Design an enzyme around this catalytic site. Structure first.
Site, PDB file in Angstrom:
ATOM      1  N   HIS A 134       0.804  -1.218   0.000  1.00 24.31           N
ATOM      2  CA  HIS A 134       0.000   0.000   0.000  1.00 24.31           C
ATOM      3  C   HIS A 134       0.847   1.282   0.000  1.00 24.31           C
ATOM      4  O   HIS A 134       0.914   1.974   1.012  1.00 24.31           O
ATOM      5  CB  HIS A 134      -0.927  -0.034   1.225  1.00 24.31           C
ATOM      6  CG  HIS A 134      -2.101   0.893   1.137  1.00 24.31           C
ATOM      7  ND1 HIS A 134      -1.997   2.253   1.329  1.00 24.31           N
ATOM      8  CD2 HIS A 134      -3.413   0.648   0.898  1.00 24.31           C
ATOM      9  CE1 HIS A 134      -3.193   2.805   1.217  1.00 24.31           C
ATOM     10  NE2 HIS A 134      -4.070   1.852   0.950  1.00 24.31           N
ATOM     11  N   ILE A 172       1.936   4.625   1.689  1.00 18.50           N
ATOM     12  CA  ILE A 172       0.877   5.458   2.230  1.00 18.50           C
ATOM     13  C   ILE A 172       0.152   4.657   3.304  1.00 18.50           C
ATOM     14  O   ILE A 172      -0.409   3.601   3.019  1.00 18.50           O
ATOM     15  CB  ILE A 172      -0.117   5.871   1.120  1.00 18.50           C
ATOM     16  CG1 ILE A 172       0.631   6.657   0.036  1.00 18.50           C
ATOM     17  CG2 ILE A 172      -1.256   6.689   1.713  1.00 18.50           C
ATOM     18  CD1 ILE A 172      -0.236   7.195  -1.065  1.00 18.50           C
ATOM     19  N   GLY A 198      -5.892   4.623   5.239  1.00 17.11           N
ATOM     20  CA  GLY A 198      -6.852   5.436   5.967  1.00 17.11           C
ATOM     21  C   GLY A 198      -7.609   4.640   7.016  1.00 17.11           C
ATOM     22  O   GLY A 198      -7.790   5.115   8.138  1.00 17.11           O
ATOM     23  N   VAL A 199      -8.043   3.433   6.658  1.00 16.14           N
ATOM     24  CA  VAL A 199      -8.777   2.573   7.588  1.00 16.14           C
ATOM     25  C   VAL A 199      -7.942   2.217   8.815  1.00 16.14           C
ATOM     26  O   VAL A 199      -8.481   2.036   9.906  1.00 16.14           O
ATOM     27  CB  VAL A 199      -9.246   1.248   6.915  1.00 16.14           C
ATOM     28  CG1 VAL A 199     -10.216   1.550   5.778  1.00 16.14           C
ATOM     29  CG2 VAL A 199      -8.048   0.452   6.416  1.00 16.14           C
ATOM     30  N   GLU A 241      -8.513   2.680  12.862  1.00 20.18           N
ATOM     31  CA  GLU A 241      -8.255   1.593  13.792  1.00 20.18           C
ATOM     32  C   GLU A 241      -7.403   2.127  14.945  1.00 20.18           C
ATOM     33  O   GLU A 241      -7.657   1.823  16.114  1.00 20.18           O
ATOM     34  CB  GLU A 241      -7.521   0.453  13.079  1.00 20.18           C
ATOM     35  CG  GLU A 241      -7.090  -0.679  14.000  1.00 20.18           C
ATOM     36  CD  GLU A 241      -8.259  -1.470  14.557  1.00 20.18           C
ATOM     37  OE1 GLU A 241      -8.067  -2.188  15.558  1.00 20.18           O
ATOM     38  OE2 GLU A 241      -9.363  -1.385  13.990  1.00 20.18           O
TER      39      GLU A 241
END
Ligand SMILES: O=C(N/N=C/c1cc(Br)c(O)c(Br)c1O)c1ccc(Br)cc1
Ligand SMILES: O=C(N/N=C/c1cc(Br)c(O)c(Br)c1O)c1ccc(Br)cc1
Ligand SMILES: [Cl-]
Ligand SMILES: [Cl-]
Ligand SMILES: [Cl-]
Ligand SMILES: [Cl-]
Ligand SMILES: [Cl-]
Ligand SMILES: [Cl-]
Lengths: 152, 150, 148, 152, 151, 152
Positions: F51, F57, F60-61, F65
């Site tokens: 990623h 990067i 976002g998820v 978390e």
């Protein structure tokens, strides 16, 4: 030649990749003189699964490895500037390591700052020395001599 | 004075992927130790050191020499004692005179040769070389300190 | 001898499924002797088994298959990295395998494979796996080289 | 003794762990006779990084391993029933493998169903045979003999 | 097409291990909806830490899978199955809303993503739907992404 | 109950382990009201292998978390204080996520700071909301509701 480089630039210069690329950003760079860079230390690193269980300590030898990579970047760019095409044909090798001293253990949450300076350089042979710092305190110190060799 | 991985696991606190000693072939208390780690392509380190050109990290050779030395220092004082091993920790203070001569790669049996240069109390200084097929691939001197865990 | 670099140019396998580190003997259409070092520093050992590292028997067979695969590639087109980069290898059959001694960290797993029969891309080899001169396993297998 | 077991139950019986626990669920189980279980195949598995790049094929040998583990679970529960306390100190050794034939390649998104039947068993030595299936089709056949042993 | 396997998904999404959370696509209707799924097996690294002795597929990763499904739908809606063009695009996910988790997901589950286009204006795509396991809704969420030129 | 907790303390409270423990240090903590913590972002993390290639990067998820874990740490300590014994009997479940916006990409070398406040809490159910910050700038926003439950 700039003084600040981010991970995308480091990737184009160093041949190192996961899980051995130990430099995240370069904040200070002065050709033939010095470099200041760092690597964030997070618990989310495979190395901590075994060093040690229930007691995460960043391997001292890896601190040294990070300093050398910093020195290597400095050496290369001092000679060719930010040149990815050539970087891709060169490789820096460890010749010697001396006066290594570990003063403070590095742990998750720490920002491992590398401070290397050029003690002597002639051609592909580079001698650097410096310290690894966390919040302004010297956690380690070392001296190394590197060789800028061909990748073949 | 052969020890195998199972014995090693009971002495050193190091686990994957930082336990860099597979077997101990020779051990003389307060004098020396000879151990080794097999180098195979099937090691995660090779994914990045380096892609398309596998070379065992020089710093990891030194780490393996350190672990062997710490094992030497520990067993010299307490022998093969798992229980006591859990109450003590051997961390390194300094490393000096390190020289890399030959690159180590998959297929190599990385042999560690450490001897006690000197020791006083819990401070032990070991030195020696790393060998592959009888040749010196690296050399170094390390100083360790044995302390109470916690 | 063929080292890891050469093996990488012929076999399509990569981490963590490349289980041959070096080729010591090669005789086209006859046999091959190679090996893989076994070290605790392998991810497999985290789960096989916890507190008791034992190199999976099935991975010993895989290492033998790969060794046989290398013998097949070279016997077919010689050391040709160009054509090799287009093929992959599929296991077809495995038979008569017996495990006698557990392989563990510190061991030098040596593969001894010979050609039993072969035609086109389909090769059938058989032999043993040895550690310090002793047979730790026996097996026969047939694999197929295919265009990816 | 139940007939349906989930990953939690499997963890309490089999000694295998990541990345070598290749059974996700048991759908049916008949003591001393047969067992049906399965393992989901997803791209998000480390094996695929090297088998093969750009062409994920679940290794044939790991399919065999999965069937063996299925047999192992059958062997253990038939011996001591569902007893985790006895299970935590047992390991399982492969003794032999025979007549295995791979027909269809297994890939990410496949539900690898194991079907094992007891051909012969005596004490700790269990000899099972069966197939691995995907969408009702046989992708593999295998015969194996494994031994359950107390860790020492 | 309507069915794409892992081979095809790899040529469209930039995501790689350990973040490619879509194994196969079973249904695709340009500009309308996508049905895909990811198998859940214990043999996944995430389970080493989520959680020890209690493998629970992370709720945020279910959302990521849905997001990835939306991105494939959006992309394929614009250019179809074009690996070459895929290399020059990126789908930035700007927001996530109304997500609710009803049933935990565990090893052995076939996590099926059900997403549909809620709105599409310019480079902005709003997607919404559910995550299902054996016919039951396991989670739901809305997502908004922007198509942009890769760099 | 103190206000600064290091990785050793987080390890005794949160059930999360590698590679899903995404909080390295707690800097500020007000029982039942708020928490400020952070996770260092380094290239030496496995997640970056996918990623994305040549463009690391932080997902976002995963930032959400991280905020959830910070919230969970606040919730638990608010309820039982620093109690490792009781912390061993729980896990945390995500119930809902809302109003999340991703304003700035997070990359290696970043110090991901979590800022969360308690919006509402009733028993084991906690609702927190806040932001994720890098060098004083809002990188992400989110609201979430979690539940602390018995391991059974
Ligand atoms: O504490 C150190 N190393 N290892 C410590 C350690 C290891 C384990 Br296992 C353990 O359970 C505990 Br209590 C330790 O302090 C350390 C401490 C200072 C420096 Br200078 C270098 C290393
Ligand atoms: O920040 C990014 N987010 N997402 C990219 C992305 C691309 C596609 Br095509 C897609 O279907 C989805 Br879903 C994405 O998230 C991005 C940016 C650069 C690269 Br290289 C890959 C991805
Ligand atoms: Cl250390
Ligand atoms: Cl090196
Ligand atoms: Cl085995
Ligand atoms: Cl195969
Ligand atoms: Cl969750
Ligand atoms: Cl993202």
């Amino acid at each position: 030649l700039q003084s600040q480089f981010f991970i995308e630039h480091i990737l184009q210069i160093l041949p190192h990749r996961y899980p051995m690329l130990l430099v995240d950003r370069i904040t200070e760079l002065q050709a033939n003189q010095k470099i200041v860079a760092y690597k964030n230390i997070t618990f989310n690193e495979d190395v901590f699964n075994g060093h040690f269980p229930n007691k995460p300590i960043f391997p001292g030898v890896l601190i040294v490895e990070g300093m050398a990579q910093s020195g290597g970047f400095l050496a290369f760019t001092s000679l060719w500037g930010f040149d990815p095409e050539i970087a891709k044909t060169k490789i820096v090798y460890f010749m010697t390591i001396d006066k290594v001293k570990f003063r403070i253990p590095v742990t998750p949450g720490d920002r491992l700052e590398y401070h290397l300076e050029v003690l002597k350089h002639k051609g592909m042979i580079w001698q650097v020395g410096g310290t690894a710092q966390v919040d302004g305190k010297v956690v380690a110190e070392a001296e190394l001599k590197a060789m800028i060799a061909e990748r073949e």
